[PDB]
Design a protein around this nucleic acid. Sequence first.
RNA 1: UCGCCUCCUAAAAGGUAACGGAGGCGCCCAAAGGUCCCCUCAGGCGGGACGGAAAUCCGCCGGAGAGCGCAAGGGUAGAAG
RNA 2: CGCGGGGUGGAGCAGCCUGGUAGCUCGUCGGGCUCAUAACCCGAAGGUCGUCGGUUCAAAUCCGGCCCCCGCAACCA
RNA 3: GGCGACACACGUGCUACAAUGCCCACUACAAAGCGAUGCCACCCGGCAACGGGGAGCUAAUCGCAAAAAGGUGGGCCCAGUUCGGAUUGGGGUCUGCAACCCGACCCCAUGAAGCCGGAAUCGCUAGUAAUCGCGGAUCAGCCAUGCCGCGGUGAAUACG
Lengths: 44, 78, 181, 24, 124
Amino acid sequence: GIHPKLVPARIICGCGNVIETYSTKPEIYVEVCSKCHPFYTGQQ
Amino acid sequence: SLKKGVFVDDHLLEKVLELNAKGEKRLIKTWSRRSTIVPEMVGHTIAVYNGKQHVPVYITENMVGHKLGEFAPTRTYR
Amino acid sequence: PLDVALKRKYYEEVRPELIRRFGYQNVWEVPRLEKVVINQGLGEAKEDARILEKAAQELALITGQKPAVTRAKKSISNFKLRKGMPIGLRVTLRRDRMWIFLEKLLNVALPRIRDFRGLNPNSFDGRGNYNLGLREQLIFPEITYDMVDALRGMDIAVVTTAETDEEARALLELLGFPFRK
Amino acid sequence: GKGDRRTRRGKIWRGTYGKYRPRK
Amino acid sequence: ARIAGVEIPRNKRVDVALTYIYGIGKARAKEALEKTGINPATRVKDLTEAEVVRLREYVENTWKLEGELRAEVAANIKRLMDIGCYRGLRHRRGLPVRGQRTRTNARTRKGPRKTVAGKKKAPR
RNA sequence: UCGCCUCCUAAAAGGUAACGGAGGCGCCCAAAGGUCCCCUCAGGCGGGACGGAAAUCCGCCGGAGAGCGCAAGGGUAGAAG
RNA sequence: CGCGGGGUGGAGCAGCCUGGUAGCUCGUCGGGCUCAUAACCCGAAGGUCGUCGGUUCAAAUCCGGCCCCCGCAACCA
RNA sequence: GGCGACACACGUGCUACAAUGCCCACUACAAAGCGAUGCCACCCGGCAACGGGGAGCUAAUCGCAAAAAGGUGGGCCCAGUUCGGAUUGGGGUCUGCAACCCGACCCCAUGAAGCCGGAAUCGCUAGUAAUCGCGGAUCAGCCAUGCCGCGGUGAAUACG
């Protein structure tokens, strides 16, 4: 009787990936995530 | 507040990029505080000066569009 | 509500490899994540009409489970409220619930946590099962940031089957957890 | 007024032009 | 007439009401009306049920506004909690971060007059 | 000091003295009571954002050292909690 | 017991019948006037107006009702 | 590196608190001064500081450079506001080897205190006071609200 509801969501990352899961609020605007690693920079 | 270049000294990379060609240590004294922060040099320790002594200021991946000075306070009691 | 990436990705990927990894035989001996208790507590409820039921409710949108009205045993003279009735907060996570929250906790709130550099290389040591220490909170793919009256840390305790470390390690190690190594 | 780097008089006070004082 | 955050201008020329919104300045706004061919004069109390949202559309959906900007700011503030940028301190330290004069002024960043004064002279 | 409750004294039944040795009471609680349904500690050692040396957590080992309004004492989780 | 009367900055006392201000000082802090000091001179920290219930647009104040003080006259199986 | 510090303090001033006002547009009227690796008309690119090209000017002869407060029209209707712009985020320009400590601008966004100022205190006897714009010296640039000059509009009152 007192919960966060839930529904199928389609999350849009910031580089490409689009994980299609559930939770709360159908549209999610993510910055980064997996498919974003190990993005190194070399080292002197 | 440049537009064409990055004022960062040369007596630094002629030291930072040689040390670059290998992956060595980090004790790197220097007075060139007046200089941008070299991309990649993130992971290296620069002994910035402040009229007093060199400074074990490391270097992160988030301090590039910032001259070495921004991390080497001058006056005491801040 | 009968399927995620993990829960699935755990079976078709985590089950076979693990098994073949250490050398178990039947499907149970193989270690498995069981549940995830996660509590905030706060302990920031004292004088001047200090409610904070939103504090909870707001955690409810991040988990899916409306937290527990915790209290504290003794009495802390050396600092505020005493003999039960104050505040401690907590929401235990069990399968599906746990899988979901767990899922995006291995996809979003990994870097969003300020800087980052990788999870501690040893926070379950000896006694199987892993606990994590939280500072932030809005790094969550929800809980807007222009609605945070305050920022409170929390505790995610992720308990398992793996009776050793090498095991509980592996489990997560091979699943989606990144370690500072 | 005389300061608001955003109006006629201001650019003036601050002896300069821009999009709030057309250099003609 | 909500639009961005729980904000609602009303009773006055549209091209000004807009400023009210967090993230909207004099420029932007009056651009909001030209872009969507909407008329400035016309109040807020006289805008077709269409023009209304029709506006909010372009609006809300381009330059992040009130809210998603609010502490979107602290992002690059707190972000300065790094190894410590001079500009870090100042916020970190509650003072002027634009190479200013503290010695005397700076009362917007310091709480107004925190007196606590002393100094003795010479008696007889 | 003067009525009252607890312990020792008090010599294994009871009681038993001193201007003996050492503490309390002159209240409380409409739930802190009837009852029926549920539940389990203290600590120790790991593991944990604020975190003492015990907050609230997680994992083991731990039957009672916790609690029970209050003095001590009897008693008690197979519940009085 | 009843008639009164009384509590409001750290102590002092006005605001008490009028509703509409939370003040007057002592004392700490600054800052004023001199040639400097003294002395006068200003502005501030600071009070649930004891308590709670209340009518009002609003309460220290008029209403309530009680804790609490002090005067008296009386009560004490 | 510091003279730029900063719990504070006083002195000199800048911007204001607004309708005798502010904003945008248009449209008039100066005087004084300074200009060669100087001042840059004028086209072009950016809502812009500015950049490219480029004519003139040894300057009464070419330019800074147009004056603002007026006037005229339109916008605001008494609100912490279209007042006031402090502080803060961002994106940028020129300079200069170099602008973190330490520049000035421009641009987007935040829009702070202030609704007229305690005791006290200062200036001024008329082209003055008040309020409005313009110059130059020092200068690579600039922290110029200063300093030295200029010109525009133009009061009040003095019994004693």
